[PDB]
């Protein structure tokens, strides 16, 4: 079975270079064309370029000439994308994807899971986690909303689960917002039966891998 | 470079409706290709060589066109089809994609439920006070949140974000955070968020008094 395994998230200062990789399994990259595609936050797909690992021939969108360098190593079945003198315009998700050319009807038939690149010189910063406590002001129709405010972290992402993943229904984890301080904040809320507040413990599990921060926060009712 | 123009940028359909979207090329191409992408995941091959469905794509999808005009059709929309669809051409280098058609789910108007959360004592110890206003399960997406502190409007000290459409009920939810210093939080009494939405016959205000 065909898989394209891309390297992990990168946080890199402006002006530096970065190398992203895509390791293929279930086929030989020499039989294909290995492409890279960029997607900026909230934007569409842009083709960067490709390499034919059988002969090393590359093609690039002229927009990316000098910015992007694509290489491939057939002995490790890996394709690479190197980006130079990074700017904020390079912050994006990068996908690797294969094409089989004419004999495989051209289309991008398998895609990697994407690598997120954040271009910033700032240090990582783990979030503070604060309860959003259920109360008479968060109850409707015999149910109560409660949550966690995950404040002031950098870079993205955080993940939030509830009761270690056992609680999934009625959860809304909101998109992160960028604050005027340049740090992110997000909230995650869950709606539960009001009757359960005195009898069911609710814990939000917050993970911020870039800072190695894991926080479990028990959210308790507030009698105002 | 061949420019691919996708119309509409955004559209919405009920389950069971026929959906068509178009892709227009700045000059002629031999075949058109399409990819489906959902938030936070990789694009998937959907249609290749204009009309061939990729593996796993259900039979309600089809593709058509020639020359400079191509289209993707869903004979009968399902909730799981809500996604962004990109067209893409292989006839000329550089390869180019359309800007996408975002297909959303149409449903009836739904008013938000509005909840408010004071700052935690934990956060207050740190010198900051975030007040959170939640608007749950509304439709359509457009909603206005207005923060008032002792009945004075608040400008430039809040942030808000809206979930993706919920695929169970096709609604949106919105979270807005007002952030003040602890000093300014402790100097005022009444904290209120006022919500305007097309589902509400008049705006709804939820509020609390600090320390009570
Ligand atoms: Cl890695
Ligand atoms: Cl940016
Ligand atoms: Cl760091
Ligand atoms: Cl995040
Ligand atoms: Cl994926």
Numbering used by the authors:
A (entry chain H): 1 to 224
B (entry chain L): 1 to 212
Give the authors' words:
Fab460 structures generated from individual crystals using several different conditions are nearly identical, being characterized by relatively flat CDRs. The top of Fab460 reveals two positively charged pockets contributed by VH residues R50H and K59H for one and R100H and R98H for the other. While SO42- anion groups from the crystallization buffer occupy these pockets in the Apo structure, the latter could potentially bind acidic MPER residues in the Holo structure, a speculation borne out. There is no significant overall conformational change upon peptide binding aside from a slight widening of the binding groove associated with an increase of the Fab elbow angle from 138.5° to 147.6°, perhaps consequent to different molecular packing within crystals.
Here, using structural analyses, we provide evidence to explain why a vaccine targeting the membrane-proximal external region (MPER) of HIV-1 elicits antibodies with human bnAb-like paratopes paradoxically unable to bind HIV-1. Two rmAbs, 235 and 460, were further selected for structural studies using X-ray crystallography. The former recognizes a MPER-C helix epitope while the latter recognizes an epitope in the MPER-N helix. Here, we demonstrate through structural analyses that the approach angles of the vaccine-elicited MPER Abs are poorly suited to access the MPER crawlspace on the virion surface.
